Design a protein around this nucleic acid. Structure first.
Length: 135
RNA sequence: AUAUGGAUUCUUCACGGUAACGUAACUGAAUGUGGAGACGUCGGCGCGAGCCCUGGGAGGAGUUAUCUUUUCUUCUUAAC
């Protein structure tokens, strides 16, 4: 009866990432020392890949399929849950509370998430997650 | 017209904040959408500026038979 799990896909509602699709990695229902509210550790897409047709050459397809990821701590009230799901075991260990509050560890996690997202986009699956929302 | 510094880039086109949002910067053609330009009158209330009134002090002038620590006057600060 609870849907705020570690694989749920949500849509950000506020904070420079509004309208961007995201997947929950680690939820914290009963607050913490900081963020005294229900929140989740999420990883999403900041720059969606562009549409690719059969006319594009091999040089241009690679450029248009690049994905720019991000990691964020988000309040539950600022997320819009969906019915889709996405596996997080490939980058669950790198996105955590220790990853934040440290500039060096933030970028190391993001490049790990970037590799997982690009391989997911190849061999098309979770196509709704990689489709930019129009609003 | 143009150069340097800074910023940015090997994850190519910046990061922080749960968020409202912040910043010295931080690619955006056609086309589209929105905002500013752009707006009546009366009433009381809040606040600002100049003026008016006034205290102490530092100067100048006037009155002084008698009274008045007194009467008058200067003490200012632009765009950006």
């Amino acid at each position: 009866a609870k849907f705020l799990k570690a694989g749920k896909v949500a849509v950000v509602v506020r904070g420079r990432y509004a309208g961007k699709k995201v997947v929950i990695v680690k939820p914290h229902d009963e607050g913490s020392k900081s963020h005294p509210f229900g929140h989740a550790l999420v990883a999403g897409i900041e720059r969606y890949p562009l549409k690719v047709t059969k006319k594009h050459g091999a040089k241009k397809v690679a450029k248009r399929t690049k994905i720019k990821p991000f990691i964020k701590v988000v309040n539950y009230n600022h997320l819009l849950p969906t019915r889709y799901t996405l596996d997080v075991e490939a980058f669950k260990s790198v996105v955590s509370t220790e990853t934040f509050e440290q500039p060096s560890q933030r970028e190391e996690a993001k490049k790990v998430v970037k590799k997982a997202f690009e391989e997911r986009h190849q061999a098309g699956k979770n196509q709704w997650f990689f489709s930019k929302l129009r609003f």
